[PDB]
Structure formats: C-alpha cells, structure tokens
C-alpha cells in the first residue's frame, strides 16, 4: 500500500494555475510567470541532481539529453524518449507518453493557450543556465491539448561561460 | 577530518559563505578582499591547469599542497566553488568535500526558502550543520589527491 | 527522495507574495491532497455497522497523514474541553530547513494550512472534519488549534 | 610517465627554458557531411568547437587542414573562408582534421608570465602561518612540481598524475642547472636558456626517466 507518494503535485500545480488564472485572466500570464517560477525551481533542483549524480557537466548534447532524462527519471519518474534528432543534432525531442507534472488533470482546460508545462519549461530551462547552457525551450506537442503524446523541443544556443573573475 | 577552514563562492564570484574551525594565522587584510584574492587564485589556477595540460581536463584542477598546509578544491557543474584548507595527514578529501556538499550545503542552503541565490548565506542552522558534519569524522589532515 | 520537489514547489508557493490574500493557497490544495490521502485509506479500522457509530479521531488520521506527508507525529496532542483540541510539535518538517529564530513566522501557517478546512464528516472525531488555525509560538514548535465550525 | 614540460622562470617570472619533452598531441580525423553537428563557432582566428564533443574531440581541438590544406587564421590556404566551404555542400563529404591548439613558444611564455604571481602570491595570508607558496599542484591529467631554491629560481616540471619522487628529478635538474650556469656570466641570471649542452644532457635524463628507477642519482 501507499506506493505512490506523489499525486499531490498534479493538484498543487492545479491550484497554482487556477489561482494565477483568477488573478490574471490572460492565458499567457499563467504561462510566463509560471515558467519563471519553475525556472527558479530548476535552479534549485539542478544543484541536488548534480549532488547525487556527480555528472561532470553537459559539455555535449547527447550527454545533456541523458542527464535531463535522468533528472526526469529520478524526481518525476518518467522516461523521456529522446527522438526526432536534427541533422545538426543541436535539438532533440522529449517524448513523454504520460505527463509527470500532472496525472489526468483533464484534456480541456476550458480554453486554449493554457500552457500546462511552464514549470516543466523551467524544469528543463533553469538547470541549463545553472549548468551554464544558454538554451531556448519550447513545446512542439502537448497530449493534454487533445493530442496523443507530449513532445518537447529544446535548442542549445550559447555555452554560458564565466567572465571577468 | 578536522580542517583549517572552508570557503564557498558562487559562480559569479561572491563570497556565498565562509567557515572557520582551525585557522590559526589571523590575517590583517579583510576576509572580503581575502575571499576575492582566493577566487582569483582559483580561477587563474583553473586557466593554468586547463591550458598547460597535455590531455583533456575533465574536471580540471584538483588541489595544491604546500610546505605546511594544503588546499583542496571542488567545482560544481553548477559553477559553485567549494575550497577547504588544512594540514597534511588524512584520507583524500575529494569525496569528503563532495559528501559535505551533498549532505549539508544542498540540504541546508538550497532547501531554505529564506536562502535566495545571488546573496550571502547567513543562518545559524547551516553553521551548526556544517560544524557538526565536519566534526562527524573529525581527526585532522588532508593529503588530498 | 520525492520530498525536494514539494519543498521547492512550496517555496515558490510562498514566493508569489501578491498584496491581495494572506492565503497564497486556497483550501483547494487541501481538498485534493487529502482526497489522495483518502485514496491511500482504502482500509480504516472502523466498524462496518450501519446500526452503530464508531468514531475515527482526526488526531489519528492526522498523525498517519503526517507520517505519509510530514513524517513526524504529534509530540503534544491535547483534547480541549470543547469538541475541539490542539496539536503541538516541537519541530516541523518544513521548519527543519530554517533556524529556530523568530524572523518570518507567517510562512509556516501557510505551509500547514494544508490541513485546514478539510472536507468534513458528520460525527465528532470521525477522521477528516477539520476547521483549524495555526498559532505558532516557537519556530520549530508549531502549534495548531482547531475550532468546531458548527456550534 | 614522461615529464611533459620541464620549465623554469626567473624572479620576474619570464619562462626561462621551455624544455619540452617529446609530447605527441592527439590528432583526430573525420570525414564530415552537410552542415555540422559540431559547433563550428568562430573565435578570433581559432575555428574551434565549444559544444557537441564527439570522437575524442576537445574544446581546444581546432581544424588544421581540410584535405591537407592548412588554415591561415580563419581562411583556406587557397583563400576561401572556413564557412565558405561550410556552406558549400557539393564537396561533401569532406575530411576535417582537428588538433588541440599546440602551445607555441610565445604562448608558453605568456602562460608562465600570467602564472608566476599565482605561485608568488599563493595565499599570502594563508590560514596556516609561516607557510610557503604553492609547492605541488595536482591536476586532472598532470601534476606540476614547483621548487623554489629558497630564493630566485623556480624549477617547474609537469609529470604524470601517478608519478612519484619528482622532487629527486627537481634535484637533478638543479644540479644540471648549476652545471650549465658554470660557464656564462654574460648569460644573465634572467636570460632565456639557449644552450644545446643542457638540451642533450636533459635528453639523457629523459631517456633515463623512461625507466622509473632513479639510483646513483640517475642522469
């Protein structure tokens, strides 16, 4: 019994999105502020993830995908199928058969533009600017939007390097 | 392993935190300029070891040892820097500093809502946890490799 | 373990500090969360009788919930002369992350609000009937007094 | 096992003697295709890669000569730009030749110049009192041994991580330093070392240290 410890985040995040909604009617506010708070979140968890894994750093793209799928595996307990590889291979698609942030919130959030993975964006984004990766993120497909399966698409841009020590 | 003192600096280069247990020689210059001098110390060391190494630096610099003390270093992939300092004789302290990082600093800095990155870490709770954690196996020495 | 996700997410729960509501979170988080906790409760040691009533103290469900959630049961669990009562803990899990100095009390009640306004039951001490306020005198020592919503 | 670069610096710190042991820097080759996974980021005449490391390629690793055409700065020897060929897909697949940028003489001079005050100012206000500057540095792939002769000369030799007894090698190079400075007072105490005698006797020392055993102190 009491196997699943974590079905409380799918409803904590639900409370977040509902109250952000009731505060600001705009569908994109509850996306961007939610993304920046999930960004600080990613800052806060990448430190512990590297504390356990002791990975050197994401100097390469495939190893970065491995580290990120490992991060999802350890905390959010989902297996990101790394697919859709670009010929330049600067980008890769994360295939989540089951959303880990939610467990069946519902397919209609009554209205579109309600980006339901903004923390996930922070989850993927924040760590990068902490592991020194100036990287852009965006979602190519969301099963929650009436779709079969959720794919994310994250594009590294500039190797963040420390300056003027 | 009881040690002289520990330094924690953010990737930007500010003094996140300092800890002292055995530092005997008390400097005359301020420990702030001392912290900045240590950070320049470390970054220029990293450049030196990166460039004069004939083979790929995976984690770069490890430590330096002197006549009378020794200094040990830890680079996080986050860019955070830990540095410890003590006398000579002990187990290698790379895993020691890693254990301190994971078990204490991650536990009692990052997890604190009061802790906001980009600032100093001032909390008696973390000072305690760090103190008793160094006092966990606290004989002495380094001889780090 | 799966604790740091909730710890950080709750830190951001605090973080948005809009100047409208002392409840950064509404009792909705409560309802859904202990509804999942009730999913955990598919067995409870309460009799099957339709003709007889047996009460499941909210104290016991509170402590088992806490082991499932906060992972440290009550240290003081006092039954007030009313139908209400009070819970006192020398330490709190979210408060273990901070020193005992009284600097920002107001966060901790928002933390523990997760046990406030819970979807009730009919009988006294029946498991979930919860109207409660947080009155914390010491930083680790979190105190919470319930008030019977009816009467 | 070998002593990678034996150096020495004056009180001012100018690298006196860039005694390089035979050090084969790794050369990599690969026949690449249409525009690349490799980060062909241009950085100040150093057409290198920062991200997307594959096949034992490091950040420093820089193209030397596509199909045996050495690069001048950023351009082709024939005068086309690197990216000029990068945009052109007809020649593909094309053979890129990567090597880590080999530290030239002036590079090593600048490296020692920038290094010197580090050791000189090495935690001057260190926690332990009456201490010295950095005596031994140990890195990911090498270990530097710096030995001050209590004033003036700093013997700086970089050896393998697992190597032991390097202090004795410092002793012998101290001996041979004396055996050299025997001859030329017009060789200033801060002029760079230019003498083939020191060179050949240190080649003998290298041949010895191919063998670990140092005895009757081995030269």
Residue numbers in the entry:
A (entry chain C): 10 to 174
B (entry chain E): 1 to 145
C (entry chain D): 2 to 152
D (entry chain F): 1 to 219
What did the article's authors report about this structure?
The TRAPP complexes are nucleotide exchange factors that play essential roles in membrane traffic and autophagy. TRAPPII activates Rab11, and TRAPPIII activates Rab1, with the two complexes sharing a core of small subunits that affect nucleotide exchange but being distinguished by specific large subunits that are essential for activity in vivo. The TRAPPIII‐specific subunits TRAPPC8 and TRAPPC11 hold the catalytic core like a pair of tongs, with TRAPPC12 and TRAPPC13 positioned at the joint between them.
The overall shape of the complex is that of two arched arms connected at one vertex with TRAPPC12 and TRAPPC13, and then spreading apart to hold the core between their other ends like a pair of tongs. Overall, we were able to model the core, and the N‐terminal halves of TRAPPC8 and TRAPPC11. The primary interactions between the core and the arms are via binding of TRAPPC2 and TRAPPC2L to TRAPPC8 and TRAPPC11, respectively. TRAPPC8 is linked to density formed by the connection of the first two α‐helices of TRAPPC3b and TRAPPC5. We detected 146 total cross‐links, and 75 of them mapped to residues present in the structural model—32 cross‐links were inter‐molecular and 43 intra‐molecular. None of these cross‐links exceeded the maximum distance constraint for disuccinimidyl dibutyric urea (DSBU) of ~30 Å, thus providing good validation for the atomic model of the TRAPPIII complex (Appendix Fig S5B and Table EV1).
